[PDB]
Write a protein that binds this ligand. Structure first.
Ligand SMILES: [Cl-]
Ligand SMILES: [Mn+2]
Length: 395
């Protein structure tokens, strides 16, 4: 109702139109210049072009998701210094164009990851799924990573071998593409061989080293963001665990603390993605929001559901997953009101993030799962929750 409601739109080629976005009840658009090569400067011309198209539809461009971080920066090799300078200039250009919140991530090699993009739920809608056994089967029988076995239980290893033996040729190829070709919003994509040799760049990069590399990026980027009035909002790892023998360092409350300890500036902030942090039961989403609320500049309000094997999860309906959406939204609302009591008024933009593929969208080739109807539904659900919290607690 007064909640800042935003919606990820991929641009002119997105099958979801800006008219769909408005009718969904979003007033803001989340987007990026996906056609601009990784690490290159986003020009004022290109930024203003996307901005104009959005304003044309009676919308505003609210949040950038994402400005991609080149792999050279993550490995601290090659042309990292130039890429950093370009990132800095991109932020200057964005700010000069009046776009002041930037979502980004530091997931190395792979971005957000699923094994199944067409998982049929009991109601017939399709969800995204990370099947731990499918993922083990890929790692040990397709990628054949030495020695991936350490990441798994004896039971999971046995189940993987069995799942792999039931897979058709096409099952194996589709599983592979699902994991490495890049899901919607990802700025990296690989063939199996490209992927395998890219992994080698990380043989001596452990959690501590990757943090060092991230610190270099942050200490260079944040003062620029602060100088120009842009706020940075880091997106968590998805899933928030170390996969493929690579570290993942934006997964827990300790990682959040590490980022604040590393760069104190308030320009160094967070995207509270409840779908990603909520994958693992030991993340206390409400406490995360209570402790880091002043630095939360963007939220993704969706839910996953852990299955019998707690590392297996699929995307749930927004109000029916592991995320206690009531408590999460209450905490966000409480944070917005404490800003207002500090004499400010600084709303936290949200987007529904992912939705199930349902109704008319089932007959379509969609961006997984950035179909419109399921995301409209999640947005409507959270809108209702937030409105009632506002009235129950802040009227
Ligand atoms: Cl969205
Ligand atoms: Mn998210």
């Amino acid at each position: 109702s007064h909640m800042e409601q935003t919606w990820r739109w991929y641009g002119p080629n997105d099958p979801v139109s800006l008219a769909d976005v408005r009718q969904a009840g979003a007033t803001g658009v989340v987007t990026a210049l996906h056609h601009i090569p990784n690490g290159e400067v986003w020009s004022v011309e290109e930024i203003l072009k996307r901005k104009a198209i959005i304003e044309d539809a009676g919308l505003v461009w609210s949040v950038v998701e994402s400005v991609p971080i080149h792999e050279d920066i993550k490995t601290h090799t090659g042309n990292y210094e130039q890429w950093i300078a370009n990132y800095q200039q991109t932020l200057r250009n964005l700010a000069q164009c009046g776009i002041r919140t930037v979502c980004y991530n530091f997931m190395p090699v792979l971005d957000w990851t699923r094994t199944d993009l067409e998982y049929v739920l009991p109601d017939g809608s399709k969800a995204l799924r990370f099947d731990q056994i499918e993922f083990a089967a890929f790692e040990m029988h397709i990628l054949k990573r030495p020695g991936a076995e350490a990441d798994y239980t004896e039971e999971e290893i046995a189940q993987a071998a069995e799942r792999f033996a039931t897979m058709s040729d096409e099952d194996k190829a589709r599983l592979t593409r699902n994991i490495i070709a890049g899901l919607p919003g990802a700025e990296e994509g690989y063939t199996l061989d490209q992927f395998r040799k890219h992994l080698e760049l990380y043989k001596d990069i452990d959690k501590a080293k990757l943090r060092e590399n991230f610190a270099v990026f942050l200490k260079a980027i944040i003062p620029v963001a602060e100088e120009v009035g842009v706020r940075m909002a880091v997106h968590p790892d998805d899933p928030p665990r170390p996969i493929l023998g690579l570290p993942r360092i934006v997964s827990t409350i300790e990682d959040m603390q590490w980022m604040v300890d590393t760069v104190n500036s308030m320009a160094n902030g967070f995207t509270m993605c409840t779908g990603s942090y909520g994958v693992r039961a030991d993340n206390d989403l409400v406490d995360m929001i209570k402790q880091f609320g002043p630095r939360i500049y963007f939220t993704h309000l969706r839910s996953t559901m852990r299955e019998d094997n707690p590392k297996t999860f699929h995307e749930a309906a927004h109000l029916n997953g592991d995320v206690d959406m009531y408590e999460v939204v209450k905490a966000i609302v409480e944070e917005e009101h404490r800003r207002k009591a500090e004499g400010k008024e600084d709303l936290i933009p949200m987007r529904p993030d992912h939705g199930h593929q349902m109704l008319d969208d089932l007959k379509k080739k969609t961006n997984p799962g950035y179909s419109a109807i399921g995301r409209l539904k999640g947005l409507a659900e959270v809108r209702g929750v937030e409105l009632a919290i506002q009235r129950a607690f802040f009227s």
